[PDB]
Short mmCIF file of C-alpha atoms in Angstrom, two decimals:
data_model
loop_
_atom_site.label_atom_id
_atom_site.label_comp_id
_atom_site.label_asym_id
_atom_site.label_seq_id
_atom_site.Cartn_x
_atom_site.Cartn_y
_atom_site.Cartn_z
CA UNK A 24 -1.34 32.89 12.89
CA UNK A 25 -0.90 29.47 11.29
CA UNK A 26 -0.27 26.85 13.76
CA UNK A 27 2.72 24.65 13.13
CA UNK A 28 2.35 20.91 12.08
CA UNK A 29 5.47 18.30 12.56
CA UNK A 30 4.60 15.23 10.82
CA UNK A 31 6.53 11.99 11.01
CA UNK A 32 7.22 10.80 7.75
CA UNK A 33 8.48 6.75 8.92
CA UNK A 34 8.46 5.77 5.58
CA UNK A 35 9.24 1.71 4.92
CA UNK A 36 9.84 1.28 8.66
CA UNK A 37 8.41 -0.28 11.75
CA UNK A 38 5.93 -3.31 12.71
CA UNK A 39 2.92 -2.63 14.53
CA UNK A 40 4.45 -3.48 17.78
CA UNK A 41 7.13 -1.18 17.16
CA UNK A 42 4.62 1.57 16.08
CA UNK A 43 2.77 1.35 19.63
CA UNK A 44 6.36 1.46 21.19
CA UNK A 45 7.03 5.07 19.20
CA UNK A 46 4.23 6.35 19.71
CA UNK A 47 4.44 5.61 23.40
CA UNK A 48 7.50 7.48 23.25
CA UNK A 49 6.45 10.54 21.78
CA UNK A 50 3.47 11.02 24.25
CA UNK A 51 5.72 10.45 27.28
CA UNK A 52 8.29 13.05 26.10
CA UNK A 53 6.26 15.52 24.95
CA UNK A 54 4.91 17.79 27.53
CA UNK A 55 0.97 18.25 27.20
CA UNK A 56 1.27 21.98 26.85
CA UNK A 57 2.61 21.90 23.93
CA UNK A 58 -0.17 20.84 22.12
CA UNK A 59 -1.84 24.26 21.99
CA UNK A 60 1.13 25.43 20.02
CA UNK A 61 1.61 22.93 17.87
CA UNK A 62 0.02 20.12 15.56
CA UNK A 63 2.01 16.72 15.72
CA UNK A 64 1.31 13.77 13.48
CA UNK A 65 2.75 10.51 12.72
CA UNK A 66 2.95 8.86 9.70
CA UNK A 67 3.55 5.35 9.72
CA UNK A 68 3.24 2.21 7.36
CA UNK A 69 -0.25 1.17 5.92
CA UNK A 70 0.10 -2.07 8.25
CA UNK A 71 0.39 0.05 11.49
CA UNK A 72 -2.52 2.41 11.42
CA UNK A 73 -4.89 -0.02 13.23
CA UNK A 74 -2.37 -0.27 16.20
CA UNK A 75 -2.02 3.87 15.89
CA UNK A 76 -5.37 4.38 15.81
CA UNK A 77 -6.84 2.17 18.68
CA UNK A 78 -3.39 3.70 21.14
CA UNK A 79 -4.14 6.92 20.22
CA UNK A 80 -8.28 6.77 20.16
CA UNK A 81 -7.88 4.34 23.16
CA UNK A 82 -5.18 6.44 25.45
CA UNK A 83 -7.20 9.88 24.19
CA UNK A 84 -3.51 11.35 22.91
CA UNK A 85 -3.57 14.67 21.33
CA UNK A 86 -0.45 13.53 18.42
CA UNK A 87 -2.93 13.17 15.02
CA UNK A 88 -1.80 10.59 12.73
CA UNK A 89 -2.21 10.15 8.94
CA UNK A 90 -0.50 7.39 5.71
CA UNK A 91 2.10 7.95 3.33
CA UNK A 92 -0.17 7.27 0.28
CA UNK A 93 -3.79 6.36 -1.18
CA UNK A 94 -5.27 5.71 -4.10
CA UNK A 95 -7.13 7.95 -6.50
CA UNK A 96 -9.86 5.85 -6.61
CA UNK A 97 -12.73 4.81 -3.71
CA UNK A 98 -12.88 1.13 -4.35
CA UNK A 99 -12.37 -1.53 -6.56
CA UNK A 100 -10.37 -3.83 -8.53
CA UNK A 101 -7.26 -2.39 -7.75
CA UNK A 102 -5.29 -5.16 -5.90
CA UNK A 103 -2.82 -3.66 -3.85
CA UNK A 104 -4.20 -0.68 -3.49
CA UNK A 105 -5.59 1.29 -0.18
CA UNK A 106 -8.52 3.47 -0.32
CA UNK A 107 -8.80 6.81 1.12
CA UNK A 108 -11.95 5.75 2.87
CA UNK A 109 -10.40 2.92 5.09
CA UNK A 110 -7.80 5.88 5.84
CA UNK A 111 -11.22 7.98 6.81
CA UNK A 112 -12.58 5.25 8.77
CA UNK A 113 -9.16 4.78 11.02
CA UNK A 114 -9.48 8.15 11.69
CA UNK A 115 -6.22 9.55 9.63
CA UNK A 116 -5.85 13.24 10.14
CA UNK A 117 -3.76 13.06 7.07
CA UNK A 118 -1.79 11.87 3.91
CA UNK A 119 1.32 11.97 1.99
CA UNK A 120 0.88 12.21 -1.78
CA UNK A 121 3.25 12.94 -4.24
CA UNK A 122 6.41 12.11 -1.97
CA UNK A 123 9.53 12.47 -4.33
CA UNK A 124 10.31 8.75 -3.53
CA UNK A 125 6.59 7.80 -5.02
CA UNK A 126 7.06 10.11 -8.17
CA UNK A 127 10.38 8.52 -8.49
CA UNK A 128 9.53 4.64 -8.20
CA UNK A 129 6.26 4.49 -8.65
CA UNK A 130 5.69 6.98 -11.70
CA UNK A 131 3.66 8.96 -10.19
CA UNK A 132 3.27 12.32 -12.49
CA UNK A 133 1.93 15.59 -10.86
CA UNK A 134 -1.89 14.62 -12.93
CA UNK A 135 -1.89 11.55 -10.26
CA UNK A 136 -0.94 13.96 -7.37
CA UNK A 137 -3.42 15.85 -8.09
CA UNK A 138 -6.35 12.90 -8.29
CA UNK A 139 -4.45 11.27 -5.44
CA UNK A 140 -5.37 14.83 -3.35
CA UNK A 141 -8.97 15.30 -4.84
CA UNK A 142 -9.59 11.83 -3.65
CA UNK A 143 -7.90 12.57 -0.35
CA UNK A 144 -10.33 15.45 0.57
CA UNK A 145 -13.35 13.42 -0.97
CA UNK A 146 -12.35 11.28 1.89
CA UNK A 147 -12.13 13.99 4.78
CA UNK A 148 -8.24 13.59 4.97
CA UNK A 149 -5.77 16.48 4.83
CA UNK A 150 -3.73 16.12 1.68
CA UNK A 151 0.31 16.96 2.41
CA UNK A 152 1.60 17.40 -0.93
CA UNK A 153 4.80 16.94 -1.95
CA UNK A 154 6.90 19.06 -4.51
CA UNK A 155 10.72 19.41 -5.13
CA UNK A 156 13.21 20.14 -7.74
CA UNK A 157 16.21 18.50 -8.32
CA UNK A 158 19.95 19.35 -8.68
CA UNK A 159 19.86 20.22 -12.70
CA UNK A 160 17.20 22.50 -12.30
CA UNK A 161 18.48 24.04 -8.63
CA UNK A 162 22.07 24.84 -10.79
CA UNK A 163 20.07 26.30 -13.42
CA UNK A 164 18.62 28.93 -11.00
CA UNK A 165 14.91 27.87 -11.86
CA UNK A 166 13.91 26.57 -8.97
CA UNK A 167 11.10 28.99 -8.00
CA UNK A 168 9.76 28.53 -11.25
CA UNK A 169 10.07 25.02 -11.50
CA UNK A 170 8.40 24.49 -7.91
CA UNK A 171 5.52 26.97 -9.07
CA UNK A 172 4.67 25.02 -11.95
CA UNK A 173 5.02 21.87 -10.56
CA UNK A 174 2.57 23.07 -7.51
CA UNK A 175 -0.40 24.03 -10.49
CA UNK A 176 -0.10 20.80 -12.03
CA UNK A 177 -0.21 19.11 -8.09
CA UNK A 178 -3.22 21.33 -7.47
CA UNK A 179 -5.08 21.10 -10.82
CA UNK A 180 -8.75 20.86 -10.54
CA UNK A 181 -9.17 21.29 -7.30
CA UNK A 182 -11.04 24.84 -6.12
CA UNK A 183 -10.12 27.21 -4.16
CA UNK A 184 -11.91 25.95 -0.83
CA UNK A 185 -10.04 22.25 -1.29
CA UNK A 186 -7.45 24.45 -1.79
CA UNK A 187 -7.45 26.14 1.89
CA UNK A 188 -7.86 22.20 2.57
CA UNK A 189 -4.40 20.63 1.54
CA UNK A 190 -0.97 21.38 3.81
CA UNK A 191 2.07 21.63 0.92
CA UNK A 192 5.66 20.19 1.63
CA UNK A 193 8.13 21.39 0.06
CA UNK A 194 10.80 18.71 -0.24
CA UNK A 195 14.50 20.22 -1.42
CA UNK A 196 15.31 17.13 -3.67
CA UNK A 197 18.54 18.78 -4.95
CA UNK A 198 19.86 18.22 -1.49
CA UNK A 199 19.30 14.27 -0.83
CA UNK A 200 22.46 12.52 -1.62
CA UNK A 201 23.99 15.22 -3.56
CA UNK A 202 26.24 16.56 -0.76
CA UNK A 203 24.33 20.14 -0.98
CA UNK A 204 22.74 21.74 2.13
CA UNK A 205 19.55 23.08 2.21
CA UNK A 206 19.57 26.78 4.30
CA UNK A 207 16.70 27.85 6.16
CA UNK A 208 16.83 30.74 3.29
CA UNK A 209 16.69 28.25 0.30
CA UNK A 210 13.45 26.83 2.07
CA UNK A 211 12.05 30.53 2.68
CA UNK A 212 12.40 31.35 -0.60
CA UNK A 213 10.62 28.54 -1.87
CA UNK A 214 7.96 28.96 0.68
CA UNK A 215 7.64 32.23 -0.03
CA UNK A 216 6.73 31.69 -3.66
CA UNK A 217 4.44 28.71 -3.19
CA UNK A 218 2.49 30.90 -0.76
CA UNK A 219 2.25 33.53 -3.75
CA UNK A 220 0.96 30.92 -5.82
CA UNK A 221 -1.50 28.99 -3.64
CA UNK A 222 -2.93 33.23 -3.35
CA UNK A 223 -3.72 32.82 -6.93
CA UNK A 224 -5.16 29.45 -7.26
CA UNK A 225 -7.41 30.46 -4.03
CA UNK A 226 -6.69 34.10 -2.47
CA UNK A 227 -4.98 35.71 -0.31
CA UNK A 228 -6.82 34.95 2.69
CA UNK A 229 -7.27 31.04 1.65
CA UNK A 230 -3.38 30.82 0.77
CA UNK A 231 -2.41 32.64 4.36
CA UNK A 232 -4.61 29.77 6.34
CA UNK A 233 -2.41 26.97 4.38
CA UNK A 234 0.56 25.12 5.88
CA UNK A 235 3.32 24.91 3.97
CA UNK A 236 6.61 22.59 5.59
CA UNK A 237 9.66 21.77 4.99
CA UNK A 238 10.42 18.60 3.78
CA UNK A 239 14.01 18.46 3.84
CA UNK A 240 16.18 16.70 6.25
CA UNK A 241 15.07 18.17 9.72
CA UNK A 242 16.82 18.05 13.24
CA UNK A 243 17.07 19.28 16.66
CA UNK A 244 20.06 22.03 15.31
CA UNK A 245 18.40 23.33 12.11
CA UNK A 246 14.58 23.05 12.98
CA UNK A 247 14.16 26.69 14.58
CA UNK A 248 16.00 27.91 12.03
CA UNK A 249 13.73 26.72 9.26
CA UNK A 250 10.16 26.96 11.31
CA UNK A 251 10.99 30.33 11.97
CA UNK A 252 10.66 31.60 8.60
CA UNK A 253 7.74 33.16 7.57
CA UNK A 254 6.30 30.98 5.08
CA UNK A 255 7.62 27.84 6.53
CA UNK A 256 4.86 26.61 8.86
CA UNK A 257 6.69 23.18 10.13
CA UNK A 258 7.91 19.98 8.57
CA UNK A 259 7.58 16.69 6.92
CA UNK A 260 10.53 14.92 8.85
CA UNK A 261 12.25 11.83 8.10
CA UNK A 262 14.73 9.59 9.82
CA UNK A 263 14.35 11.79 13.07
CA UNK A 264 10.69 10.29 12.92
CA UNK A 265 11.54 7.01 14.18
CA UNK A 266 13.19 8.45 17.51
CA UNK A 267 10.50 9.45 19.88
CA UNK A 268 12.89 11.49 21.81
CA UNK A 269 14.01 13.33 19.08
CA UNK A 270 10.68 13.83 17.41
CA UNK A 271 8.95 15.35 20.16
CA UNK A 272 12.10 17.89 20.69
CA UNK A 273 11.00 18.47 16.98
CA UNK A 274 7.85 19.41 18.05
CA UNK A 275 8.66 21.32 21.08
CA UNK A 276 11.28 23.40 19.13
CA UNK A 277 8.21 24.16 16.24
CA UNK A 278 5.63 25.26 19.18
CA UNK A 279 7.91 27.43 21.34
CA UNK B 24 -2.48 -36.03 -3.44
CA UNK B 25 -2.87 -31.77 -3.22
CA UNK B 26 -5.13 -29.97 -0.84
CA UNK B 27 -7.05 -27.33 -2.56
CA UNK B 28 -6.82 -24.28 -1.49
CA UNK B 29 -10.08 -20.97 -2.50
CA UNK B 30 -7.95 -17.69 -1.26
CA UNK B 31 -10.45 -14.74 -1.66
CA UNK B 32 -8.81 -11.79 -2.90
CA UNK B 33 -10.92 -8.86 -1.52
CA UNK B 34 -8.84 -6.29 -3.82
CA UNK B 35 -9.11 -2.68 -2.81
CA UNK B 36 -12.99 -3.43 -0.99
CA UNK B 37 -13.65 -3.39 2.67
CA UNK B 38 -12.63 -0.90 5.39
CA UNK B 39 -11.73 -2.56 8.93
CA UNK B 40 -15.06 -2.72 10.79
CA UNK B 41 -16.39 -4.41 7.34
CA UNK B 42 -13.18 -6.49 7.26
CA UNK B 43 -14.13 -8.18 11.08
CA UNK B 44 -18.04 -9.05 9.75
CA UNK B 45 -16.73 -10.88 6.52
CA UNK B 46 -14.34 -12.79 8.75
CA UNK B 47 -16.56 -13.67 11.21
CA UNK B 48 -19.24 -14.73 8.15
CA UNK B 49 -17.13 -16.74 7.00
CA UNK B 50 -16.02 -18.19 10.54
CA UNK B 51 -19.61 -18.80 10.84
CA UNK B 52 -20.93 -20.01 7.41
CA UNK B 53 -18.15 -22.75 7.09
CA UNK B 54 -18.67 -26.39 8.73
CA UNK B 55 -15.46 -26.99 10.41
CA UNK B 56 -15.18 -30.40 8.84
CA UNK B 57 -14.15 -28.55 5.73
CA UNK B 58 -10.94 -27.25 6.74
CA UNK B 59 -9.39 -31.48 6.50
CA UNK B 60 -10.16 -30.97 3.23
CA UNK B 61 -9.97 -27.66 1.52
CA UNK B 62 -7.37 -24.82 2.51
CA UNK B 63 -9.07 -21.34 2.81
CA UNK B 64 -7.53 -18.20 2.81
CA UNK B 65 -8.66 -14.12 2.68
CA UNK B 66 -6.62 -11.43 1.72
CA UNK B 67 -7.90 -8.06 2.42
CA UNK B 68 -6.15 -4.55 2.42
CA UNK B 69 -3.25 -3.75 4.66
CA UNK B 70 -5.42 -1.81 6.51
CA UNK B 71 -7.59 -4.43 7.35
CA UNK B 72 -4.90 -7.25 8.20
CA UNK B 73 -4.43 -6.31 12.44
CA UNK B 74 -8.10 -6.49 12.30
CA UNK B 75 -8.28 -10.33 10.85
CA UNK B 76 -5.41 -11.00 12.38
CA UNK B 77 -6.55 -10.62 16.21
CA UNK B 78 -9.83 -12.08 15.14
CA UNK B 79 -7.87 -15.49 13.80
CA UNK B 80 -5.61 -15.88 16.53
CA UNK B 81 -8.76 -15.01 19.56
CA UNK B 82 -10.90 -16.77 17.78
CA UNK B 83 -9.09 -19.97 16.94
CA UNK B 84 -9.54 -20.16 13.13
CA UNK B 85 -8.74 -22.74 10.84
CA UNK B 86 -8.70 -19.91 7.84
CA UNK B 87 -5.04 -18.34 7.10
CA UNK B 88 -5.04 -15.07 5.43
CA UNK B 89 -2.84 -12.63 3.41
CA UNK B 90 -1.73 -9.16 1.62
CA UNK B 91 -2.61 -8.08 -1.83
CA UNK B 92 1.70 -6.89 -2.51
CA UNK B 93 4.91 -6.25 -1.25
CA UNK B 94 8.00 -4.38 -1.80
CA UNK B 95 11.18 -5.99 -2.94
CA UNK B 96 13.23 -4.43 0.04
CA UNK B 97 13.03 -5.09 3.48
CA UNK B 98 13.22 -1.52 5.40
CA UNK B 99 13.97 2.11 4.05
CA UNK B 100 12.91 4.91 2.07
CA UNK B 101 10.37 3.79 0.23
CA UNK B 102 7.54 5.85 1.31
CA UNK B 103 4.04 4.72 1.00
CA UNK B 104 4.99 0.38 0.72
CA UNK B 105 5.08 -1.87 2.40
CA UNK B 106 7.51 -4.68 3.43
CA UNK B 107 7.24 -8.29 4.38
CA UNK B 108 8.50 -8.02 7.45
CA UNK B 109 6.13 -6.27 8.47
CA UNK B 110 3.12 -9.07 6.98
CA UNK B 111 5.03 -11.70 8.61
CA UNK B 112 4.66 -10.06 12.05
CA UNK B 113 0.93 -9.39 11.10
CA UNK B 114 1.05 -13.42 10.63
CA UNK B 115 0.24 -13.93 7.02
CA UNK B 116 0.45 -16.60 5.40
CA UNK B 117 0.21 -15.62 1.75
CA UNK B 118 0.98 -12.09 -0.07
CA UNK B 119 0.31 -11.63 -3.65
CA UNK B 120 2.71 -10.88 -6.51
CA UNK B 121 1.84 -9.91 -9.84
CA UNK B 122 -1.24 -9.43 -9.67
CA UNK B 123 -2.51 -8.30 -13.62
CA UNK B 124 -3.78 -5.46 -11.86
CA UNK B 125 -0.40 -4.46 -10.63
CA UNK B 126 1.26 -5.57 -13.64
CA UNK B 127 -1.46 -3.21 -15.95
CA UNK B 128 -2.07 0.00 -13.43
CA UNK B 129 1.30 0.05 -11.89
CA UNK B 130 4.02 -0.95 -14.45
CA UNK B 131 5.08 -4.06 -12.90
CA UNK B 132 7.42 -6.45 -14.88
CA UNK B 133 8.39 -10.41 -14.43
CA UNK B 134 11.34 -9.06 -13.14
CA UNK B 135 10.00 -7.22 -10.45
CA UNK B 136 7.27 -10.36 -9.27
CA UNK B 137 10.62 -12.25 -8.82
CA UNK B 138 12.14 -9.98 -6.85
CA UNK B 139 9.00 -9.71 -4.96
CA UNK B 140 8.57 -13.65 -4.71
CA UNK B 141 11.86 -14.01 -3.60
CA UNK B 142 11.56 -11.05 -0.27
CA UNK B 143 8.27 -12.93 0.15
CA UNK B 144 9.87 -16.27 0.83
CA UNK B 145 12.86 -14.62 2.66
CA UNK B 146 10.00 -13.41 5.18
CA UNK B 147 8.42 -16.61 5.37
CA UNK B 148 5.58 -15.96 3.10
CA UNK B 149 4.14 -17.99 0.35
CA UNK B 150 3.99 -15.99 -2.58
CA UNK B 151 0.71 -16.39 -5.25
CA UNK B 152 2.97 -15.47 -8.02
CA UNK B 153 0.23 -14.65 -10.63
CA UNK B 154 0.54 -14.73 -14.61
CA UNK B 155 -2.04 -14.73 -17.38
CA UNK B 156 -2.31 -13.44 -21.38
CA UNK B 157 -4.19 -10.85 -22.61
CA UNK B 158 -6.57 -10.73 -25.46
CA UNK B 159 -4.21 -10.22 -28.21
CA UNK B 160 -2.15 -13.21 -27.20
CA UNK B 161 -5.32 -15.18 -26.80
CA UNK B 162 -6.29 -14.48 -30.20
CA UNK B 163 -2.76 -15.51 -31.71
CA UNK B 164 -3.12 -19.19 -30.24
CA UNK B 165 0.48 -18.51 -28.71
CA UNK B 166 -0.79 -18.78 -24.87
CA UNK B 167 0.58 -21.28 -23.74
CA UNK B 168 4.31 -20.14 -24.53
CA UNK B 169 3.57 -16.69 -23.59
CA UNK B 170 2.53 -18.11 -19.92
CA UNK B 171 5.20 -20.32 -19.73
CA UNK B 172 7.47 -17.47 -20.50
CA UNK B 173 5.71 -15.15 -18.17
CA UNK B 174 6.02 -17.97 -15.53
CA UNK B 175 9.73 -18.02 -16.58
CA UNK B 176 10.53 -14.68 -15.97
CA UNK B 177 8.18 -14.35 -12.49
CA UNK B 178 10.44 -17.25 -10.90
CA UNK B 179 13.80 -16.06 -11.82
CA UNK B 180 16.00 -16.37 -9.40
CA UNK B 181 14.75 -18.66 -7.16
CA UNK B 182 15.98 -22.05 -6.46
CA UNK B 183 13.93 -25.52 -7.13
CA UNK B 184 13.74 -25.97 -3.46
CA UNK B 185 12.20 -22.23 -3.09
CA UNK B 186 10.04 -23.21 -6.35
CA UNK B 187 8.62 -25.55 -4.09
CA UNK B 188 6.86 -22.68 -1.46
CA UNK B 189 5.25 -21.01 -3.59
CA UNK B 190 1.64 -21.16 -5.12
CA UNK B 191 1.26 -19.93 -9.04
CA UNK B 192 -2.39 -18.33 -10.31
CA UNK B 193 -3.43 -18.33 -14.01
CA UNK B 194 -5.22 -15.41 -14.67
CA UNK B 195 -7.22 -15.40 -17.90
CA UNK B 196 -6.45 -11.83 -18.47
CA UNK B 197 -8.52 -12.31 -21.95
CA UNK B 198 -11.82 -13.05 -20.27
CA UNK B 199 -11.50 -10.26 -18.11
CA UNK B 200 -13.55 -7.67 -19.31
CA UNK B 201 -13.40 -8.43 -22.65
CA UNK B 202 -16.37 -10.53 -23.19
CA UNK B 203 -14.85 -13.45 -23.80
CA UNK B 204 -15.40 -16.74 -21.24
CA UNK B 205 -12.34 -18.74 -19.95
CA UNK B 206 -13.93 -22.60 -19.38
CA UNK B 207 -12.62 -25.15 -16.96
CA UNK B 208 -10.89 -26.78 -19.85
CA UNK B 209 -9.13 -23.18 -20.85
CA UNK B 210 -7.73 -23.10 -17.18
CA UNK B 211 -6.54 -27.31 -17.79
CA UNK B 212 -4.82 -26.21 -20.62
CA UNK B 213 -2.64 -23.30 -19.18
CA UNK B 214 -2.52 -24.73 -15.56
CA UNK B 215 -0.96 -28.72 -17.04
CA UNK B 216 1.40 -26.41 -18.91
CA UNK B 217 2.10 -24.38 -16.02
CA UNK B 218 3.27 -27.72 -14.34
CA UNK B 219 4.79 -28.88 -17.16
CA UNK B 220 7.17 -26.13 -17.08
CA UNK B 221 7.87 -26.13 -12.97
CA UNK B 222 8.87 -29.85 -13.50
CA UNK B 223 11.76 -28.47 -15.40
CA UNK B 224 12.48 -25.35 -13.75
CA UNK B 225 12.46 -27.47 -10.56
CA UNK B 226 12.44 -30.83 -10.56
CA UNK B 227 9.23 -33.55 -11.18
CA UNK B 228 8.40 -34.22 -7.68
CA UNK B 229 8.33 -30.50 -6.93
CA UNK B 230 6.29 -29.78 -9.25
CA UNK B 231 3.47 -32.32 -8.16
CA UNK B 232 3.46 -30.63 -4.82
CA UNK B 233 2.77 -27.59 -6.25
CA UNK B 234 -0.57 -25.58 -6.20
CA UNK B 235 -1.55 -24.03 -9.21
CA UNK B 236 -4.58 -21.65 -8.86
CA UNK B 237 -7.04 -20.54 -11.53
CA UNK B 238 -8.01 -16.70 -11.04
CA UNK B 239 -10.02 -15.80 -13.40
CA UNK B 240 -14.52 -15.30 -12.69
CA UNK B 241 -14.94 -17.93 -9.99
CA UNK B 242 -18.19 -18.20 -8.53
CA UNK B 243 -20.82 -21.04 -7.09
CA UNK B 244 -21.74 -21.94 -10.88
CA UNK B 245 -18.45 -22.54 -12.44
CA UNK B 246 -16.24 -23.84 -8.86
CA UNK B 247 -16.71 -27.31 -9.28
CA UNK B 248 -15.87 -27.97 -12.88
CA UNK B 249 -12.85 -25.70 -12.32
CA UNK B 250 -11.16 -27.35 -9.20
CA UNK B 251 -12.26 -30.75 -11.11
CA UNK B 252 -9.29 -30.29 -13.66
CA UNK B 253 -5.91 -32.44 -12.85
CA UNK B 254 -3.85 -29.68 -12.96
CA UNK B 255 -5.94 -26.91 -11.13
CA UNK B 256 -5.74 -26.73 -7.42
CA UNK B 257 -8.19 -24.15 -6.39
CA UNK B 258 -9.16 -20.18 -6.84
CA UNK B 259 -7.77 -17.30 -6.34
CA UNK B 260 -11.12 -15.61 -5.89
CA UNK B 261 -12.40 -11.89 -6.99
CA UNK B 262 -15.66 -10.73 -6.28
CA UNK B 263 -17.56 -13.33 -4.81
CA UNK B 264 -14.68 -13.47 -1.59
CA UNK B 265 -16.59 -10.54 -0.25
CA UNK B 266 -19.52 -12.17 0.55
CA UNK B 267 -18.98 -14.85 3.29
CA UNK B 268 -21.57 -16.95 2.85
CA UNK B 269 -20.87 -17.44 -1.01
CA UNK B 270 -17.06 -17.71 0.04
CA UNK B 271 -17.81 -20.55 2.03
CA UNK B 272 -19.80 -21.93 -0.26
CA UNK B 273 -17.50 -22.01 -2.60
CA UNK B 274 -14.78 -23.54 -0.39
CA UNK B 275 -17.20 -26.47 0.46
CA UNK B 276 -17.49 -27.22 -3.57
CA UNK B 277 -13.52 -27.38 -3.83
CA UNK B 278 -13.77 -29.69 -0.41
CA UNK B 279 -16.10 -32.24 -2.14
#
């Protein structure tokens, strides 16, 4: 079976302080068992990850934690910019790249994705990458299509072994700010056909090892629904991330 | 009369173990009597900033630090930045807007520095609000305008008084892998301007109180005849910040 992953995406939110505060949260509310079942990661700002890392290192805590970007290179004049190794060497299990709101502000094109997640593994991180259509191209119907294509270019260059290395996201774009709702079907099918795909950029076996979450907005009413489809294998959540509470109900929904 | 000030911009070098040894270098490479006379300043990755900042505070140190960027918003849903609320609570002093590196690898306009500079000072930071020509402007003789214009355009918005907290850096973006040298009479030029120009965006006596950085090759050789200049105030520093005992050294030059 694949074991689930619920990652906290916290996005531009919370001090360091704060961070030690949620992740104290978490850990208190989520029964140890749990663990077994399922993979729980937070995700907080660049600024943070020291405090993260010496709690969770420190304390021994089972949650995994990971950033919401990197750069594609290791070092260097790049002022600004955060390697993948000082991710490494905090101990990240993980990291965002290609997160709609990067490709959006920051012009990030699926070519950087893919260099962002090369670099990632280089690094020993996880990759979660992000891919999602938007409204015009959900109303035209070609949203499998659309995804597919948008996962090779995310993937390019990278083999089938760094392949079996990434998780994918799959973040329903179309329905943020739109109005639209997102059903646990509409993520299914999506799932469904990046799984096909990863099957031919790898193989069968390599694509049926990779997690693939949902990205879309994710709560304590609509999270069974959606981590109980077959090719949805957990989720990228956002706002629910910065309530500890409701995170770890999150995560105790995905294990069981 | 105003107090130098050699801020060593580490760029996207040094993971957080590496991060505590340059501070510490530094801590212990630098006579103490320095500090009446020179301001000194490092400004590693975000990743690295808990790290200096626990060091600074436990140990006592007379050097301030900062970040390499910032987002113009406070909070949200801006995945992967990184706001200056959060750099305040880390206790920097500084942050870094503009750099040419930003402005080159990541699209970012005058417009956007201001906007920057501005959330900066609303968190209590003191921007380096950097400008500087490239080549082909260099080699049209129309630098000064085109820095005065750039300077223009990177303070927008702000008020005299607020013109007053910040710190400006002239980066010869022409000498900067191009071949071409910069002198200490190239970074007069742009840097008198430079003042020239705050006097009437602000007011005279604000604009004597400002510091006006140069930011182009600094090192041991060149320090001296640089922060010599009437108009230049110090460094902002590249390569030679990460090694502390240079670093110092080149702080005790700007000190007398």
């Amino acid at each position: 079976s694949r074991k689930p992953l619920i990652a906290g995406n916290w996005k531009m939110n919370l001090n360091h302080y704060e961070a030690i505060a949620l992740v104290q949260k978490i850990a208190f509310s989520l029964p140890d068992k749990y663990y077994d079942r399922v993979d729980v990661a937070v995700i907080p700002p660049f600024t943070d990850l020291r405090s993260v890392q010496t709690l969770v290192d420190g304390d021994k805590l089972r949650l995994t934690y990971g950033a919401q970007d990197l750069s594609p290179h290791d070092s260097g004049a790049y002022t600004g910019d955060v390697s993948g190794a000082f991710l490494a060497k905090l101990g990240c299990s993980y990291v965002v790249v290609g997160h709609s709101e990067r490709r959006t502000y920051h012009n990030e094109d699926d070519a950087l994705v893919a260099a962002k997640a090369a670099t990632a593994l280089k690094h020993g991180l996880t990759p979660i990458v992000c891919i999602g259509e938007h409204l015009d191209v959900r109303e035209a119907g070609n949203h499998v299509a659309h995804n597919i294509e948008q996962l090779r270019g995310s993937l390019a260059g990278l083999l089938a072994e760094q392949i079996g290395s990434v998780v994918i996201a799959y973040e329903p774009v179309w329905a943020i700010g739109t109005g639209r709702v997102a059903s646990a079907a509409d993520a299914q099918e999506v799932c469904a056909a990046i799984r096909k795909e990863l099957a031919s950029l790898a193989s069968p076996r390599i694509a049926d090892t990779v997690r693939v979450l949902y990205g879309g907005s994710v709560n304590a009413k609509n999270v069974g629904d959606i981590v109980a489809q077959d090719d949805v294998d957990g989720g990228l959540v956002g706002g629910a991330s910065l309530d500890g509470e409701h995170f770890a109900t999150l995560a105790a929904i995905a294990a069981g």
